[PDB]
């Protein structure tokens, strides 16, 4: 598994070199913003259930076919599987966010996944949408939390978004 430092190290090694002063300071900056990062990961963990629930309510509000017989979130067994997948993806997105690298998300969760859903007859476009809704709400929480020091978290909100967007793209 990689994190943002480990990634630097692998690229340096492929040159046969000690880390460039370029790469050093990029990593010094990651340490600089790490308290904000911890709050951002904490924002997701602290509201995981609601993020999934709210995404869910809204997914089925839009796509009332999934909860009809014939639909891929019917009966209870399938809805529980769908709720479970929402949690799994939100979980690996939070891991990537602590790590500063998408690799755990791509390697353990996403990249593939599409071919699973294809065989499962699971409509990937609906799954992509559920991921887009989790993103909206998750970032909502990253931006408006309990008595965190005021500052600018937009860099981290972007990065979190790209992890949500990776997953969506990979699946649709």
């Amino acid at each position: 598994m990689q994190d943002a430092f480990t990634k630097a190290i692998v690229a340096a090694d492929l040159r046969g070199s000690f880390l460039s002063e370029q790469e050093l300071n990029q990593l010094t900056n990651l340490v600089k913003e790490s308290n904000k990062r911890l709050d951002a990961v904490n924002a997701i963990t602290g509201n995981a259930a609601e993020i999934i629930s709210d995404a869910a309510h809204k997914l089925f509000a839009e796509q009332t076919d999934l909860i009809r017989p014939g639909g891929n979130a019917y009966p209870n067994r399938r809805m529980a599987a769908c709720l479970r997948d929402m949690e799994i993806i939100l979980r690996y997105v939070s891991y990537a966010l602590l790590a500063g690298d998408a690799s755990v998300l791509e390697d353990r969760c996403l990249n593939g996944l599409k071919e699973t859903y294809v065989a499962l007859g699971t409509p990937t476009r609906s799954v992509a949408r559920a991921v887009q809704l989790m993103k909206e709400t998750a970032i909502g929480y990253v931006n408006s939390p309990s008595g965190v020091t005021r500052g600018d978290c937009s860099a981290l909100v972007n990065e979190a978004a790209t992890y949500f967007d990776k997953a969506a793209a990979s699946i649709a």
Partner: protein
């Protein structure tokens, strides 16, 4: 690749669990510690050239016979491959410093070490003595928590070789 960050994530994943306060506290340690680590890294990085030549020589001064003909400290190629090897170790030490864990050392030098050294007739004693010397000189390039970090990883290599 073992870092504080990857370790806590691995432990969460394997229990199917979001990162919680236990895991985020851990991560803060790694981030709080980065300054000392990275100071050690910068000092080891710019002195690399001489740290390597110092340790290479010390292998010959402690094992005089190595530099006689028919031996493995003789001729340009042995002495070249030696400098390179110590340089590999210092390189991974700096990586381990920067990474926040032994991962780079575990994955690129420790995994397989003995099998390789045994097939190629390379004695660990040389490498321990290279590292003992590097440890002596790093005593005056650093101090405080950067020195402790440098030491942690140098010693880690010496234990890997014993």
């Amino acid at each position: 690749m073992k870092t504080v960050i990857t370790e806590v994530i691995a432990s969460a994943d394997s229990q199917g669990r979001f990162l919680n306060n236990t895991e985020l506290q851990a991560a803060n340690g790694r981030f709080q510690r980065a300054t000392a680590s990275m100071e050690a890294a910068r000092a080891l990085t710019s002195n690399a050239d001489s740290l390597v030549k110092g340790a290479v020589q010390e292998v010959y001064n402690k094992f005089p016979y190595l530099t006689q003909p028919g031996q493995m400290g003789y001729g340009d190629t042995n002495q070249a491959k030696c400098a390179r090897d110590i340089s590999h170790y210092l390189r991974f030490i700096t990586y381990s410093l920067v990474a926040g864990g032994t991962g780079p050392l575990d994955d690129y030098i420790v995994a397989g070490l003995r099998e390789v050294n045994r097939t190629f007739n390379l004695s660990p004693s040389w490498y321990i003595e290279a590292l003992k010397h590097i440890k002596g000189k790093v005593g005056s390039q650093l101090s405080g928590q950067p020195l402790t970090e440098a030491n942690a990883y140098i010693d880690y290599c010496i234990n890997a070789l014993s």
